[PDB]
């Protein structure tokens, strides 16, 4: 209907993530909902999340939808009036949006310390989180070089290099097949994530997993920068266990937590063993 | 090897009996007859005690051209357990156990015997819907082997390719 | 001088390798040489090998040149007349060129046995040796699947896929960044090689080392098919130790022998510990 129009118009901010826009659309449609019962609202918003992930096939949209449903259930467990409960839901959603829209800056502030002077950083594709981290690092009078792969499916590496050149940072574009070649000249690898699975692994661009192995074979540190709304309760046993709704040439793949050193979220610097703890404490 | 190393040294020996053919009991009795402090165990415990073993010494039926092994079943698991704990694996085999063939004759490498050894005939009507396989031999890769002791001395697997060339002709590989 | 035009016109047979054409040109210019001393012949042929390598930056050309120089130095040790020695060199070079042309079939008929029925093979780029091995197995009444990488620098995997489709073989083209994705769905990896280093490793297309690492991480057998005239006495300690004359985005890289299972040459099926043996026995 018109929910897709609003969701696609909310993505006029180039810095706004897809999951953030989906959550904003869900909150707007919860505000404008004329329902008088909690079950009808839950069902309508569930079908709306279904439509949203039908429009955008990213894992972040599904993660945000599940987080919104869990927040709805948590707010409904308390008051049980659906009027005062609705006001509480509205104010809590406002506060949650205001707190989650500034998580990238906090991630950058807490992650930019791990970058030394004169080190070499390896990135896979274009991501706003790595860009903000590198900007916060170069703002602290740090000097380093950046290697970025081209990400052949959609040339996001050239876009990342063009965005980094405006920051006066030496950047070099390498091919996807030359990952194992420049791995010895890189001091650390920093990648983003589209979704963090239960065990601790990530779900990212197709050329990420093969880069986490080549780093593990050389004891290179491998850091993942991702927000908190990307925590999804999924457990892929292998590359085939990933749902086809997210992969569709595959557009995404899974990386095991044993190849990940640290995660930098708005909750802080965590190990791959903390995502499962957070998901269990949330009772999603 | 063990009974010659025991007349001047004293050490611990553990024998894991194979489940289909429990021939490890005979070797255990023959070793205990010489006073070597021999112990008997099953295959399932091979990994369980693997953390308290300093060296593994085995033999084989034949050696392939790439340094691989055609051993008794359950030996690949022992090699994997020794590689997990970085335990050296020694192979005692003479020179007449070198075959120029390469691991490309699958579906016939292992020797299959009657299923009577694994599952008895007195089970009942379930024997008509259950597939029972009893392979006698198994394949051991060359990267899980540390040393080869033969009548000429000690060698590495990465040199076996030479010994074959010193024993057989390339025109007699297919025979 | 106008010698490179004879080497370029020698490669009018699309199935002839570069090293074979270089050796044929060297033998032709040895026949047409009018010198009366062995030192002058050696100097002229070293200069000609340098001129030929200046055009083709492949490692196979240098390997063939060094092999030809070693053959000359070996044939110049028995007769010591430069006329008797010249006739013996001409005859031995004719026999060597006749024997080299039969190396591809000799590798194929010996390597096709390692392919089972219903198997899944993984190839990186276009290689005539791999193509001959695959077409020798389908002639033996065998059915299998092939996954060919795209080779983003220059699209060589598409040519291999077209050849396999012409040979009625089910082939699927994958991206350079998806090697770590389909590695779990493959039974063995058969790749070519432009040059075999002393320690047993190979020098192949840039997207070979990462695939070898991914296959080692998943215990997948990594097979390499290459001729014998590609044996060069080089010892790269890392990726940067490879000479820049062969890499020129790098066009080639080095794979250590620790990730190679077996080698299929015209000398037979060897281990990575047998190339150094031949290089020492040859006294190259």
Curated annotation (Swiss-Prot), chains A, C:
BP terms from Gene Ontology: cytoplasmic translational initiation; oligodendrocyte development; response to glucose; response to heat; response to peptide hormone; T cell receptor signaling pathway; translational initiation
One Pfam family hit: IF-2B
Keywords, comma-separated and alphabetical: Acetylation, Cytoplasm, Disease variant, Initiation factor, Leukodystrophy, Protein biosynthesis
Cellular localisation: Cytoplasm, Cytosol
Regulation: Activated by the chemical integrated stress response (ISR) inhibitor ISRIB which stimulates guanine nucleotide exchange factor activity for both phosphorylated and unphosphorylated eIF2.
One term of GO molecular function: guanyl-nucleotide exchange factor activity
Gene Ontology CC terms, in alphabetical order: cytoplasm; cytosol; eukaryotic translation initiation factor 2B complex; membrane; plasma membrane
Modified residues (N6-acetyllysine): 31
Its job: Acts as a component of the translation initiation factor 2B (eIF2B) complex, which catalyzes the exchange of GDP for GTP on eukaryotic initiation factor 2 (eIF2) gamma subunit. Its guanine nucleotide exchange factor activity is repressed when bound to eIF2 complex phosphorylated on the alpha subunit, thereby limiting the amount of methionyl-initiator methionine tRNA available to the ribosome and consequently global translation is repressed.
Assembly information from the UniProt record: Component of the translation initiation factor 2B (eIF2B) complex which is a heterodecamer of two sets of five different subunits: alpha, beta, gamma, delta and epsilon. Subunits alpha, beta and delta comprise a regulatory subcomplex and subunits epsilon and gamma comprise a catalytic subcomplex. Within the complex, the hexameric regulatory complex resides at the center, with the two heterodimeric catalytic subcomplexes bound on opposite sides.
Disease: Leukoencephalopathy with vanishing white matter 1: An autosomal recessive brain disease characterized by neurological features including progressive cerebellar ataxia, spasticity, and cognitive deficits. Brain imaging shows abnormal white matter that vanishes over time and is replaced by cerebrospinal fluid. Disease severity ranges from fatal infantile forms to adult forms without neurological deterioration. The disease is progressive with, in most individuals, additional episodes of rapid deterioration following febrile infections or minor head trauma.
Family, similarity comment: Belongs to the eIF-2B alpha/beta/delta subunits family.
PANTHER family according to UniProt: TRANSLATION INITIATION FACTOR EIF-2B SUBUNIT ALPHA
Protein name as it appears in the record: Translation initiation factor eIF2B subunit alpha
Gene from which the chain derives: EIF2B1
From Swiss-Prot, chain B:
Subcellular location: Cytoplasm, Cytosol
Taxonomy, superkingdom: Eukaryota
Coiled coil: none
Quaternary structure note: Component of the translation initiation factor 2B (eIF2B) complex which is a heterodecamer of two sets of five different subunits: alpha, beta, gamma, delta and epsilon. Subunits alpha, beta and delta comprise a regulatory subcomplex and subunits epsilon and gamma comprise a catalytic subcomplex. Within the complex, the hexameric regulatory complex resides at the center, with the two heterodimeric catalytic subcomplexes bound on opposite sides.
Function: Acts as a component of the translation initiation factor 2B (eIF2B) complex, which catalyzes the exchange of GDP for GTP on eukaryotic initiation factor 2 (eIF2) gamma subunit. Its guanine nucleotide exchange factor activity is repressed when bound to eIF2 complex phosphorylated on the alpha subunit, thereby limiting the amount of methionyl-initiator methionine tRNA available to the ribosome and consequently global translation is repressed.
Pathological association: Leukoencephalopathy with vanishing white matter 2: An autosomal recessive brain disease characterized by neurological features including progressive cerebellar ataxia, spasticity, and cognitive deficits. Brain imaging shows abnormal white matter that vanishes over time and is replaced by cerebrospinal fluid. Disease severity ranges from fatal infantile forms to adult forms without neurological deterioration. The disease is progressive with, in most individuals, additional episodes of rapid deterioration following febrile infections or minor head trauma.
UniProt record similarity statement: Belongs to the eIF-2B alpha/beta/delta subunits family.
Name of the featured protein: Translation initiation factor eIF2B subunit beta
Gene name per UniProt: EIF2B2
Positions spanned in the full protein: 177 to 351 of 351
């Amino acid at each position: 209907e018109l929910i897709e129009y609003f969701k696609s118009q909310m993505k006029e901010d180039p810095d706004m993530a897809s999951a953030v826009a989906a959550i904003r659309t869900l909150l707007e449609f919860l505000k404008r909902d004329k329902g008088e019962t909690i079950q009808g609202l839950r069902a309508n918003l569930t079908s709306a999340i279904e439509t949203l992930c039908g429009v955008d096939s990213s894992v972040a949209v599904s993660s945000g939808g599940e987080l919104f449903l869990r927040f709805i259930s948590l707010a409904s467990l308390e008051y049980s009036d659906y009027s005062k409960c609705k006001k509480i839901m509205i104010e809590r959603g406002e506060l949650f949006l205001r707190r989650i829209s500034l998580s990238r800056n906090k991630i950058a502030d807490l992650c930019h310390t791990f970058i030394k002077d004169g080190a070499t950083i390896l990135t896979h594709a274009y991501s706003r989180v790595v860009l903000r981290v590198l900007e916060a690092a170069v703002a602290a009078k740090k000097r380093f070089s950046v290697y970025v792969t081209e990400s052949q499916p959609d040339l996001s590496g050239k876009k990342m290099a063009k965005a980094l050149c405006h920051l006066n940072v030496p950047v070099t574009v390498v091919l996807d097949a030359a990952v194992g070649y420049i791995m010895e000249k890189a001091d650390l690898v920093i990648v983003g994530a589209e979704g963090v699975v239960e065990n601790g692994g990530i779900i990212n661009k197709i050329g990420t997993n093969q880069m986490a192995v080549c780093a593990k074979a050389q004891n290179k540190p491998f850091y993942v920068v991702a927000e908190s709304f990307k925590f999804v309760r999924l457990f892929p046993l292998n590359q085939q266990d990933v749902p086809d709704k997210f992969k569709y040439h595959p557009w995404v793949d899974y990386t095991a937590p044993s190849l990940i050193t640290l995660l930098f979220t708005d909750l802080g610097v965590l190990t791959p063993s903390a995502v499962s703890d957070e998901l269990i404490k949330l009772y999603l | 090897f063990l009974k010659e190393a025991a007349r001047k040294r004293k050490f611990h020996v553990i024998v894991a009996e194979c489940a289909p053919f429990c021939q490890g009991h005979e070797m255990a009795v023959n070793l205990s007859k010489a006073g070597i402090e021999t112990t008997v165990m099953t295959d399932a415990a091979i990994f369980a005690v693997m953390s308290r073993v300093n060296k593994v010494i085995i033999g084989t039926k034949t050696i392939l051209a790439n340094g691989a092994l055609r051993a008794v079943t359950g030996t690949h698991t022992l090699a994997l357990a020794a590689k997990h704990h970085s335990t050296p694996l020694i192979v005692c085999a003479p020179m007449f156990k070198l075959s120029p063939q390469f691991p490309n004759e699958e579906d016939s490498f292992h020797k299959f015997v009657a299923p009577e050894e694994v599952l008895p005939f007195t089970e009942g009507d379930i024997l008509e819907k259950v597939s029972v396989h009893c392979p006698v031999f198994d394949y051991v890769p060359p990267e899980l082997i540390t040393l080869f002791i033969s009548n000429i001395g000690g060698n590495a697997p990465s040199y076996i390719y030479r010994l074959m060339s010193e024993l057989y002709h390339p025109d007699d590989h297919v025979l």
